Swiss-Prot record, chains A, B:
The lineage of its organism: Archaea, Methanobacteriati, Methanobacteriota, Thermococci, Thermococcales. This is Diphthine synthase. Homodimer. Keywords: Methyltransferase, S-adenosyl-L-methionine, Transferase. HAMAP family: Diphthine_synth. The diphthine intermediate is not stable in vitro and readily eliminates the trimethylamino group. It is not known whether the elimination reaction also occurs physiologically.
Amino acid sequence: MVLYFIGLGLYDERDITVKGLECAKKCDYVFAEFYTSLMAGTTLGRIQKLIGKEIRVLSREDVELNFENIVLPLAKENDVAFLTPGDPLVATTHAELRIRAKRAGVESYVIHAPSIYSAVGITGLHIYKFGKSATVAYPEGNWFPTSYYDVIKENAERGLHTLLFLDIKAEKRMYMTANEAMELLLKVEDMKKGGVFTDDTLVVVLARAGSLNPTIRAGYVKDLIREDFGDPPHILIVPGKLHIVEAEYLVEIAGAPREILRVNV
Amino acid sequence: MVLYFIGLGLYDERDITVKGLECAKKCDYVFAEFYTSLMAGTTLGRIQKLIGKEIRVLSREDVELNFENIVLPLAKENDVAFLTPGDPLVATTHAELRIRAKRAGVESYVIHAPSIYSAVGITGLHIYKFGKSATVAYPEGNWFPTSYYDVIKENAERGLHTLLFLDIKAEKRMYMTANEAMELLLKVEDMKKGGVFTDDTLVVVLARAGSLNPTIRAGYVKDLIREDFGDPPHILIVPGKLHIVEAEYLVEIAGAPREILRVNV
Ligand SMILES: Nc1ncnc2c1ncn2[C@@H]1O[C@H](CSCC[C@H](N)C(=O)O)[C@@H](O)[C@H]1O
Ligand code: NA
């Protein structure tokens, strides 16, 4: 009679919370999805070993089209868990699944876990200063999307930071690198000429948040565009004007050039 | 030889990640602060029991003025941990403590935990649609904070949602309720008269995120301003322009007036 939305966390199998783990262990059935994102620091086998139960993986179609035929039926007579990377309901379409549960007469509860939305706090950038967020999508065929560029523009214009999610082909396990994102943004700049993203733009790259050894780098595009930030996933951020405290953290902790203390503050 | 920043999560001691628990267990000394947020579902005893270590609680002054005199000295010959509610680097000034550690020759590591910043996803509002965040602070003497009002105005103008952290005076055991935040906002409105926050403004209240049955309510200020949302902590959200799916969730899950289903595209 109960469906539990449980977040897996940032990186590996130990990023789930104690509450989430214990709940997963008490559920009769455990489902998971890895189409919204992957857990780069672990494997399905390791998550299964930790939970001590077989995990049935669901595709985007299984969830988006048949959630009520695959998961909800069992949730009527058993305790069922639905695992998702990060924090449940952060993924735009998952909240509606709670409505489907209601329509089916199934109770649902949410057990949270860390999300990159809050984890970016490790970059030293003040969380309250983040504005609208966006996703950098790969252009394809005759389609060249650029709305993420406009989001950066509107945020920076108001002195806010922009959290940029990078494209991912979950099914094919293919990540867009921060390097590719920067190249794309420069191309968009050459197109729109808005003076929004250039070789002189200060950016922050966060790789493998959740790991005990994440990569946190800050610097100008001209210098970071060919830098190796390690294995994915990569998150790109375009800070607005910095608080001196933010700049000092980027210099001391993220290896940013001292120059930011006078140019970007 | 190192210092661990470990978040304890939203509500109770089990909101800590497995990673945070295992790392905390292997530390020689454990410190913590409980003034940046309120963990309404646990106590120091339960936390100590779970981690199996005695925990030394620090005041805002112990941290802000003497972190390097109380905590860092021990991290030079032992592994030390510093626990905080939610995520240690979200809506706190704790990030600067990493600079203090560095200058003291102490390497530090961060272990995330669920944060209210991402937990807002449970309201059904698209997390990427949130703009600049702000804090509703208690007036003090002749000083009456009002900047949070302008934040709402700026976000709303852009169709973005506004997350409002509410004030807290831990030493006085004072936790601002969404009701008190609404009252203050109405007073600021009478002054600035920007039509930003009125009896007709749609708001969303999230109380005790992290618990199994948090209070999630949406409606007009005139109707919610005197509603009982249960024990603290509470956060208040002023949505911008709603997507239909956001409105549907607010109505179905947060008991919002069915009339908000009719969006003015
Ligand atoms: N479980 C919870 N439910 C509702 N609001 C919460 C909350 N935890 C924190 N808050 C809100 O955030 C304020 C503390 S701000 C510190 C937040 C913390 N670092 C985190 O990551 O969550 C509180 O005064 C309250 O308004
Ligand atoms: Na945000």
